[PDB]
Design a protein around this ligand. Sequence first.
Ligand SMILES: [Zn+2]
Ligand SMILES: [Zn+2]
Ligand SMILES: [Zn+2]
Ligand SMILES: [Zn+2]
Lengths: 6, 10, 9, 9, 205, 205, 206, 206
Amino acid sequence: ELDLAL
Amino acid sequence: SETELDLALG
Amino acid sequence: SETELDLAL
Amino acid sequence: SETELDLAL
Amino acid sequence: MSSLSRELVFLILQFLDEEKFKETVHKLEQESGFFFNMKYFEEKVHAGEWDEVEKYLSGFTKVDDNRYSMKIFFEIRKQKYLEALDRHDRAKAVDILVKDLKVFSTFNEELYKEITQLLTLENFRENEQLSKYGDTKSARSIMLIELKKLIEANPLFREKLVFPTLKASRLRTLINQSLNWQHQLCKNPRPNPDIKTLFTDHTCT
Amino acid sequence: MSSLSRELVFLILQFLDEEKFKETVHKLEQESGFFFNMKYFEEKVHAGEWDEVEKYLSGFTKVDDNRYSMKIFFEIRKQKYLEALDRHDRAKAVDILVKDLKVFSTFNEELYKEITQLLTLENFRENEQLSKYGDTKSARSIMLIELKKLIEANPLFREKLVFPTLKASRLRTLINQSLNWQHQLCKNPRPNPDIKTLFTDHTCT
Amino acid sequence: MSSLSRELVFLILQFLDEEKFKETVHKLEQESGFFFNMKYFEEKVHAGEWDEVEKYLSGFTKVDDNRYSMKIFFEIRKQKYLEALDRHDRAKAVDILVKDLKVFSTFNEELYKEITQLLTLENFRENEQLSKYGDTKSARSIMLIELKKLIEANPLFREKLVFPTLKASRLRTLINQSLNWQHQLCKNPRPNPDIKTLFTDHTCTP
Amino acid sequence: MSSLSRELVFLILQFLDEEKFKETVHKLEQESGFFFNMKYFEEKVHAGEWDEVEKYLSGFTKVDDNRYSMKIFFEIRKQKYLEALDRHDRAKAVDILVKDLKVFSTFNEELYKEITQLLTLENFRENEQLSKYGDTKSARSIMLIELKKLIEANPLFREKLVFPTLKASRLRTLINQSLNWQHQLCKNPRPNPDIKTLFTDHTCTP
Ligand SMILES: [Zn+2]
Ligand SMILES: [Zn+2]
Ligand SMILES: [Zn+2]
Ligand SMILES: [Zn+2]
């Protein structure tokens, strides 16, 4: 969800 | 005096 | 003779 | 002071 | 209070739109920060105008205000970076990586490192997570759908996304009322008052 | 008196300026083309923001509309070109030469050629017509003076350079009157009511 | 006399070619200036290796030595320039125009101006003199034909275009004779004789 | 006694050096692979001519031939990369990283990544291993001392570092002997015999 990744 | 309306390098 | 030795486009 | 094949900075 | 004046901005927005001053409308949305225009935002993202996208956003939120808005900027700048790689402009890609994406490194180092290493691949589609990115056009569209949701969920945008609905030319209607109030104060009114300006109050005599 | 709309734009301009929406003001000036803001123009010329300068001008005149507006654009793009040469960015200089200055060739073909040939000089000040130039800050200032005269004489700006003069917040003043007109018609009134909104007319009950 | 040492260079050229050291052959050609290799020149021109072309030529003639050699360099640099325009690298095109072509402006002011103005064309083939150019492959070939003629007529190449004709491995043959002459001054050798090195003269005992 | 060809190359090297054909000397060293010229190598490294350094080296070894030569190339391409960062030409720095440094990732994955990440620093001296770095002049000198040792220890260079020592112009001396051997087979001489050419054997006739 709010996670920062590719 | 009349403005310069010309197009040159000046 | 024929080779033109002159520079141009 | 002997072989350094160390591949690094 | 100013919540009334805040409404005035909205009236002006409608007026501007009706006179078809399009750029002025979006500058006012941005600078007032009262209304975020999705349709416009989407249009600019699809066009890849990133400078304007970030400029318009900067009227509403900064990068670190909350996790929603932080992910929003990150996604935008990531896509920016990938497109640079895709046209094989490595000069720009590294410029983006340092100017735009570095701020996110502090919070997660490892992702920044992994993003950095994409520079060295033949095609970033060699990375398995990005293996599915098949178009500039398609990626933008996919990412856009993601952004809409992030924005709608963002607490700072949550009450800013729906334009109030008014009859046409609400401001022109109000202006007209101000003229009626002016004339009703006239001693000696002609039943047909001819109004010279909006700049100073009308009078008769 | 003549256009309700034109007058109303002026009121909005004043409102926007008071609320310090700087960008919105000038987009509206530009898009409406009702008022050309000299102060803004000078500021932007001094800053060398050429893209915006040309954009602002574009709300008023096109490049070939008349000899005045033609010299204005020529001077600006010439200056743009010289600054590029001066910083030795020949990639940009040629780009400017092709994109911006080629249009003037139609008139003085030879002049265009002469300007083109400046590329091959060590320093364009080697050309005797440009021998008095330098540095950038000074050239801009000298040119600005000339631009002002050209603008002031241009038929398309000539009636557009003076802002009407109004009491502060004339727009807010009128808005107030529309509320007075609304409330004075409701029966039967409270002495001092609360305003529900500007979106729909107030009444009492 | 150099009428000798010059011949020695040719023998070395043959040796080098036989040992297939290609790059060394052409550096020796260039630095000695004794032999101009057309086949090599054409090959580099076709490849558009312009830096090597000018470097190789520079072993033989400078730009202003005579009208032939001046047209040679002019034609080469012109093509260099056109290719830069054609790949739309205008930064490089101006660099060529200033570094390489400016030398010609002094005696042709007008031509330099005309060449400069090609920068502003959408496509330089809009110029009526250049209206015939396509494509990089073909332009090079046409220009090369011209270059050959220019070089062949150039007095500075006049004794340099034909390789002497020699038996195979002449230098190796000569060296072998030196060993024979060394040994025929010797003392009581058997017909062995054991030759240790070329580095110092042979002797039989010790 | 072993290789005529090989020995002859050295004589030619000496001749070339005496005639001051500098570039030809080093192409021949390179293409023959018989002699690695330390002095030349150091000179080119100090000057930072990297394309040429790698080119010269390639006459003696490929990048992956052994750990010594692999360290040599690695060091050189590393320095190339650092200098690109240092002049802030990040476009070139990335180009080096992909073309030149990627080959080393196979054996070392993490190190390649670590080197990659130097791109994102204000200054690569922020890395503690590199905190010691510059100037450019000094870094080159440091790295060179190391390279010298790597070359001296490398099995492919180890027997190629010492030039034979010869009387000046040994080749010219030998050439003369061949003329003397040619003439001694003459029946019989001109009073002072006259030699026209090296290209075909001399003989004596009135
Ligand atoms: Zn009235
Ligand atoms: Zn009321
Ligand atoms: Zn003997
Ligand atoms: Zn004889």
